[PDB]
Design goal:
The protein is α/β, with parallel strands linked by helices. The structure holds zinc ion (ZN) (3 copies). It is classed as viral protein.
């Protein structure tokens, strides 16, 4: 028994072809089964033919005869169908509303999640359907990881480099840091974990969670995790207050957090508040500063990534009493300077999926562009708070959608929070970039921030751009542009001070080639997010949807504190770079 996800109607049915098996009421179950290929139905039992060796599962060909279900062929003389009068048969057969359209829920139930439209619907549908869609998606994502062939260690060529043997009659996943493996050692009568791993074309380079002497027969699978059902909405119902509520502001603050006093008050005068923090505008500074402005306030800081929760801890470590902080960790090496897994501690720092059920004065969720509606619901499910602050930047990178291939995913469709920030704007905006040279700030202010992002620093006169298409080669799942790396090699010989630069590209393969030919440290734009470097060398590599995504370009060029060389493929972003142009040697 449960709740129709369209009617909320109390029902004893679930769609057996829907991977999540939503509860559907008589009405909605019918309206679902007669309008889609979804025809298995589950009650306190499965609507299947209890006759011996008949495969009839379809609910539109089944009859309740006695207290056992049967198809046309097997049914007893006295039987009624299971599926007639616009209602499939089950408990609570009287209480059952329906819907003017079931269209959206059918699409969510039956889409494969390859098309943009699927993610758009999941972010414009009713809130109950936002939850259903978020589960359906995450479970579809986790199942697709199983369709991947097992990789097995054939040969250990070196230390940090392997030969992989791959399960036949299955595809192999891409080898970039968006595919994280778990290893396993072969045992008597089962297997045990040996850490998480990542791979890259070599033979294969492997970067593992722990160190080992892993030997032949050790094998690797993308570990999938059981997706829980979602209860809580992605956003609580909003409220606006006329005073600050349940928070007691400090009387003496420091001139370090004084630019945020207005904003911290706003946080106290509404139930939740959206903060857009462009690159190096001070999001974490803002987030810790909030504590000092409400010193009695209990504050759970949360984010999707260990990395993001840890950067909050690093900042906390410099301003908040250590004894009054705790890092929640489930039984990967994360921040270890606060008492571990102490929930009743004033300042709790914890990833979303490891959050305890607990209350707080304020909840600070960071790097929000990386949150899915799934994570939103979980936070609301685990944390009841007087005040929720969602810090992030919808002009930065979302969570990867591995299944997505047809269309691009717009920032207004990353999650419920980013939808709000792109449609009604954010509650607050950190408008001054402390990190980048003026040229980079000017460029992205115009590009993605409506010309409201101002440069704290001057022009560096150290930002350059070159238009060089060069030559694009493709390996299995990545791009390489050797002539763009050539141009960078030639620039470095003439500009040797740039040897302190990081190499960023939108492809880990370009990165690998660059590493061998330049010996610059490398990041993918995605791997670079929330990191700063004095000098950055960016090769666009291709003119793809991927390499020209304005949010990826935004993150790419905002990693520089002092100077940047962009070797560009795309005439459009090339022309949008307010940088000194360079001719080709
Ligand atoms: Zn219903
Ligand atoms: Zn279904
Ligand atoms: Zn039968």
């Amino acid at each position: 028994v449960g709740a129709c996800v369209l009617c909320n109607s109390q029902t004893s049915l679930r769609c057996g072809a829907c991977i999540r098996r939503p509860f559907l009421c008589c009405k909605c179950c019918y309206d679902h089964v007669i309008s889609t290929s979804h025809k298995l139905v589950l009650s306190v039992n499965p609507y299947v033919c209890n006759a011996p060796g008949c495969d009839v599962t379809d609910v539109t060909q089944l009859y309740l005869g006695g207290m056992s279900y049967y198809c046309k062929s097997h049914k007893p003389p006295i039987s009624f169908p299971l599926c007639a009068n616009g209602q499939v048969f089950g408990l609570y057969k009287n209480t059952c509303v329906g819907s003017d359209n079931v269209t959206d829920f059918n699409a969510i139930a039956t889409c494969d999640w390859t098309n943009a439209g699927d993610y758009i619907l999941a972010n414009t549908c009713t809130e109950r359907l936002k939850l259903f869609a978020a589960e359906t998606l995450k479970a579809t994502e986790e199942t697709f990881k199983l369709s991947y062939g097992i990789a097995t260690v054939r040969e250990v060529l070196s230390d940090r480099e392997l030969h992989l043997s791959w399960e036949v009659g299955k595809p192999r996943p891409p080898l970039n840091r968006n595919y994280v493996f778990t290893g396993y050692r072969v045992t008597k009568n089962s297997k045990v974990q040996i850490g998480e791993y990542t791979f890259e074309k070599g033979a294969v380079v492997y970067r593992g969670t722990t160190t080992y002497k892993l030997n032949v027969g050790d094998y690797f699978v993308l570990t999938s995790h059981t997706v829980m059902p979602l209860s809580a909405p992605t956003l609580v119902p909003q409220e606006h207050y006329v005073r600050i509520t349940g928070l007691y502001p400090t009387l003496n603050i420091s001139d370090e957090f004084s630019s945020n006093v207005a904003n911290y008050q706003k946080v106290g005068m509404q139930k939740y508040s959206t903060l857009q923090g462009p690159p190096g505008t001070g999001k974490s500074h803002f987030a810790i500063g909030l504590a000092l402005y409400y010193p009695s306030a209990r504050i759970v800081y949360t984010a999707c990534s260990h990395a993001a929760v840890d950067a909050l801890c690093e900042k906390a470590l410099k301003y908040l009493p250590i004894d009054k902080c705790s890092r929640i960790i489930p039984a990967v090496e994360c921040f270890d300077k606060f008492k571990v897994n102490s929930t009743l501690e004033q300042y709790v720092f914890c990833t979303v999926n490891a959050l305890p059920e607990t209350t707080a004065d304020i909840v600070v969720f960071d790097e929000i562009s990386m949150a899915t509606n799934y994570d939103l619901s979980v936070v609301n499910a685990r944390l009841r708070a007087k005040h929720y602050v969602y810090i992030g930047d919808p002009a930065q990178l979302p969570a990867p959608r591995t299944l997505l291939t047809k269309g691009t995913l717009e920032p207004e469709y990353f999650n419920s929070v980013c939808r709000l920030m792109k449609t009604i704007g954010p509650d607050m905006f950190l408008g001054t970039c402390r990190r980048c040279p003026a040229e980079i700030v000017d460029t992205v202010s115009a590009l993605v921030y409506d010309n409201k992002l101002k440069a704290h620093k001057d022009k560096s006169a150290q930002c350059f751009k070159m238009f060089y298409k060069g030559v694009i080669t493709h390996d299995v799942s990545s791009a390489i542009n050797r002539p763009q790396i050539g141009v960078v090699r030639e620039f470095l010989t003439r500009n040797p001070a740039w040897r302190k630069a990081v190499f960023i590209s939108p492809y880990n393969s370009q990165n690998a080639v660059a590493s061998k030919i330049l010996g610059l440290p490398t990041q993918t734009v995605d791997s670079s997010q929330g990191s700063e470097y004095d000098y950055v060398i960016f090769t666009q590599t291709t003119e793809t949807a991927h390499s020209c995504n304005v949010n990826r370009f935004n993150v790419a060029i905002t990693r520089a504190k002092v100077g940047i060389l962009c070797i560009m493929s795309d005439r459009d972003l090339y022309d949008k770079l307010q940088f000194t142009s360079l001719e080709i040697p």
